[PDB]
Amino acid sequence: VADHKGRVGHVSQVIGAVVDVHFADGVPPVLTALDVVDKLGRDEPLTLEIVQHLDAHTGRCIAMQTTDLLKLKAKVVSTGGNISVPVGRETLGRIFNVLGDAIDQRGPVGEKLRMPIHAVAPKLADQAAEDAVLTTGIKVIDLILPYCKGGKIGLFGGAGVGKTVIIMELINNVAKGHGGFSVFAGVGERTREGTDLYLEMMQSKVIDLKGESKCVLVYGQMNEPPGARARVAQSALTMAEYFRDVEGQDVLLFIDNIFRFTQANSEVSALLGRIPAAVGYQPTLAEDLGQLQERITSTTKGSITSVQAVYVPADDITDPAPATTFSHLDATTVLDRAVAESGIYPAVNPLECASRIMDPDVISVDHYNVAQDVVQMLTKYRELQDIIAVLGIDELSEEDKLIVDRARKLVKFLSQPFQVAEVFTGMTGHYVQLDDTIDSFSGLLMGTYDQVPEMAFYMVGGINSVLEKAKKMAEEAAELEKMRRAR
Template sequence: MYLRSLPRAAKAATAGSSKQLSTSIRSFQTSTARLAPSFSAIQHAPMTSQSQSRGAHAISNPTLAGIEKRWEGMPPQEQAELWMQLRDRMKVDWNEMTLQEKKAAWWIAFGPHGPRAEAPPGEWSKVFLYAMIGVAISGGLFFSIHAFARPPPRSMTKEWQEATNEYLRAEKSNPIYGISSDSYKGKGHVQSPPAKSRGISLEPEDGIARALGKSARPTFARSTITPLRQKAAPAFAQPFARRWASTDKAQDGKIHQVIGAVVDVKFDGETLPPILNGLETDNQGNRLVLEVAQHLGENVVRCIAMDGTEGLVRGHKVVDTGSPILIPVGPGTLGRIMNVTGDPIDERGPIKATKRAPIHAPAPEFVDQATTAEVLITGIKVVDLLAPYARGGKIGLFGGAGVGKTVFIQELINNIAKAHGGYSVFTGVGERTREGNDLYHEMQETSVIQLDGESKVALVFGQMNEPPGARARVALTGLTVAEYFRDEEGQDVLLFIDNIFRFTQAGSEVSALLGRIPSAVGYQPTLAVDMGLMQERITTTQKGSITSVQAVYVPADDLTDPAPATTFAHLDATTVLSRGISELGIYPAVDPLDSKSRMLDPRVVGQDHYDTASRVQQMLQEYKSLQDIIAILGMDELSEADKLTVERARKLQRFLSQPFTVAQVFTGIEGKLVDLKDTISSFKKIISGEGDDLPEGAFYMVGDFESARAKGEKILAELEGSS
C-alpha cells in the first residue's frame, strides 16, 4: 500500500514545500559515461546545506515516484546504475533522505525483482529434491560397499595380543575399565569384543546385517532407529546372508563395584532391570541375590545384597531374573524355616512348594477389604479385657529390652493355634539367633510344629547377624507367605513380626549405604513410606484376614522416638510392656493404663465388657495417684474408702498376671488359657468385693476367680496350720 502511494506523496511534497529539489530530473536513458563524472563530482562536492545535498545527486523525487512502474521496462544496466546511486546516497547522508527516497531504496533492494528478492516459488522444493537424490546415492554406495566387503576380524592376532598384554602389564592398566590396577595380570582382556546384535538374531550374519543392525550411532539416534531396525534389518539382510554367522546372545551384567552390602552392576545393553528387580550371581558356589535400588546412569544399577558379599570381584557375571525376589508359598512352608530369599535353613531339604510369589506386591483394593469389626480372643486376660485385639488388625507390642516381648508372642502363637486352629507365620527380623532356635524347639515340644505331621506355623528368619538388605526385606517375605494363606486358601492368619523396630533400623542402614540424607535422629527420609507400604498389605479381605502382632523395641524406653512413633499411626491396638511392672514380678508385664485399643467400644465388645474394663482402669489409676501419699505418709493416713480402693487395686494388679504355657519349663506353673466370659466375671467379682477376704497372693499367677479362691483358701489354711 505504501509503495503505491509514493507518487501521491511525491506530488504533495513538491507542491507544499519551497525546499524541494530544484535540480532537473536526470533521465535513466543517459549513458554510463555521462553518469560517472556527475556521480564522481557529487561525492567530492562540498555540502553547504540540505538543499545543496539533495540537488547534488542524480536522483530526484519524481524519478523515484515512478520507479515502481518503470523498473521492469528499464534495461539491466540502468537498473544497476540506479541502485548504485541509491546505495552511495544512503551511505553519505541517510538521515537527510526523504521518506519517499528511503521507501524507493527499500523497494529496489527487496522488491519482487530487486537484487535481494526471495527465490521464486518452487525453488526450495527443487533444492530439497536434489539433496535427497544425493543422500540416496551416497547411502546406496555405503551399503553396497559394506555388503560385499570382508567382515572385520573378530579378534586380534596372537602377536598383537602378546604385545598388548606385555604393554598393559608394564603400565598396570586395566583395558576394560581404564584405571590402574596392581592386581591386573593382563590375561584375556585384549581380545576385541564381539559385535552385539542388540536384539537382532541373524543366522548366518553378513555385512548388510552389520550395516543395519550394528553401526555405531549417537545415543539419541540409536534410541530412535532401534525399533525400526529390529523389524527391517532381518528381512532386508536375509537374502544376502553368507557364511559369517554369529551365535552371540544378549550379555548379562557384570559387577562394577562392591562397597560392603552395596553392589554396583553394569549392563552392556540398553535395557536395565527395573527398581526392586532381583539379580543373581554366583559367590564362590553360593547363590547371592541382589535387589536393584537405584539407577546411577551409564548403564550402572546400584543393588543391595541379601547376603554377605565377601568373595565378590569386579567383572563377575550377574543375571537379571526379570522379576522381584520370588519365594515359595503354600502349605509346603508350614513347619519349615526359610530365609529372606526363600531358601530353607532348617537342614531338612528343599521346601516342597509348587508356587512362588514376589515379596513386593500392592495392597488389596479398597473394594476388596472387609470393614466389619470383630474381636480376636487370645486367652490372655489383660489383653482380652483392657486392650482387645481386632481380627485382621495390627497390634503393636511395645517394650524395652528384656521385658518379655518374645515370650508374649510365643504364647499368642500357642493360644491361637489351640483356640482357633488357624495358621501362623512368625517372622524374626533382626533378633537373636538363639531366640529363634529356642522358639523352633519349643514349638516342636508343644506340637505347634510336627516334623512328621501337620504344622500350624511357618518361620521366616533374618537375624541380627544378617546384612541390612536381608533384615530390611525379611518382613516382606513373611508377609508374602501370610498373604497366600489369606488370598488363596481363605484362612485367618496370624502374622508375628519380632521385631518391627529392626525393620526400621535396617532401612536406615540401607538408606545410609545408598547415600540418602538422613532425617530426624538419623532415620531414613523414607521412614513413613517404607512403613506404610508394608502395613497397608496387612488387612482383612472378603476371603480371609491377617492379624499382625508386631513387637516394637522402644529405644531407651522413649515412645516419642521416630521409629515407634511412626508405627503407632498404623496400629489398631497397642500393648505396652512396662519395665516397672516386670520389676514387680508380674508377667505378662502389660501396662493396663498405657495399653489402648480401638476395639474397646461398647458397640463392639458390649456394654458389660466396656463397663468392667473402665472400672478396672479407674481403680488402678486411683491407686497410682495414691502411691505418692503412701510412700510419704503410709497407709494409716488414708481414709477407709481409699484403703479399700488400694487393697482391691493391688489384687487387680496381681490378677492381671497369668501363667504362660511356653514359660512352664521355667516357672513350673501350668499355663492357663482363660475364656473372655470368665475374665469379665472374675474382674467384676474382685471390683464388687467378693475377694476381699482373700490375701493378695491368691490372685497371683492364676487363671480365673475360682482358681484364685482355691489358692487363697489353701494359703489361709497353711497360715492357720503354721500358727
C-alpha cells in the same frame, strides 16, 4: 506365561552391596531378582534385586548376600519377576532366609507354590467393615488393651521382661482359639537369639519335627548385609498373606525388630546416593513403613494381626523411626520390670497401655464399662498407695479400705500362668475366655468376691480356678490351724 525370563546381562560396576548390571536386550523391571550365574569360587550364591534404572540398557541393584569375589563383566540372569518365597502349610516348622531357602538342614521344602516378596497393599474394598476383637485368651490384654483383627500391635519392654514368652503364648493361643498359624520375622536379630527361640518352640511343641507344626521362622540376622535385612520383613509377610488370602484364616505375625527394617533401609539409601532427611534417615522413611505396614491388615478374605517390637533409639520417642510408626499401631502393650520383679506375670503395666478398639462401638458396652472400672480403680489405688506410705493403713477411710482390698485383688488377678511357661511357673496354663474375663472382673468390682482371699486370685485363670484355689486354701489353712490348736 513369563517374559524376560532368562534374559542375560553383565555386571557393569560393583561398589559395595550396590551393583550395576548391563543388559543387551533392555533392562528388566524394577524389583526384579537376578541370579549371578558366573563362578564357583564363592561358597554361597549371589542374588541381586534391581532398585533403580540408569539407562535403557543398565540397571542398579542391591546384593542380598556379600559381593565378595565378584569380577566385572560377570554373567547375570533374570529369575522371571520379584524375589519369590515359598508359601502354604509345607513352610510350617521350617526356618527360612530372606530369599526363601531353607536354613535348617532338614531336607527340601514341600512347596507347591511360590509368591513374590513385593506385593501391593489391599484396596479400600478389601478392608473389613467390622473392627473385630482378636481374643488372645489373656486377661490383661483382652480386658484392658484388646488386640483387634488386622491390628498392628506394639510390644514395649526392656531386656528380660517377658517378650519372647508372650510371643510364644500368642502363637499357642492363636492356634487354640482360632486355629491359626504364626510367622516370625527375625528382622535384624541376633543369630544366637534365633537358636533359643527355635529350641524353646521345639520344647513347647509349637514347632514339631515328627508331627504337626504351627509356626514359621524367617530370619535376616545382623551378620547379613543391609539388602537382606531390609527385604526379610516382607518375606515373612508374604507367607502370612498366603494364610490370610488363600487359606482364609486368622494369622499372627511377629516382627522383632521393626526399627531394624527402617535402619536397614537407612544403610542402602545411603549407598544408593540419596540425600538423608531428618536425623540421618532415608527420605522415604514414611513411605517404606507405609508399604510394609499397610499390607499387614484385616482383609475380607482373612486377617493378619502383627505384634511388633520397636526400638526407641537413645530413649528418644520424638525420633522419626518410632514417631512415624506410632500412627500405624492399634494396641500398645507396655511391659514393666518392677511389675515382673514384684511377681506379676505377664508383666503388663496396664496404665501405660492403650488400644484403639477400647470403644463402646467396637466391643460391647459391658466390656468397656468393666474395663474402664479396672483402669479407674487402679488409678485410685496408686494415689492411695502414696497416702499409706506417709500416714498409714489404719488412717484411710472405711470405703477406701475396701477399694484397696479390691484393687490389691485386681493387680493379683491380672497375673496369669502361661501354657508355654509350664517349665518356669511349675503349673498348667490357662486360656481365659473373653466372656469369663469380663464376668469375673465385673463381679470383683461389684464386691461379690470380697470374702474370697487375696492370694486365691494370684496366678490363676478365670473365676472357677479362683474358687478352686480358695477351696484348697480354706482346707490347708484349716489343717495348719488345727495343728497349732494342740501343740
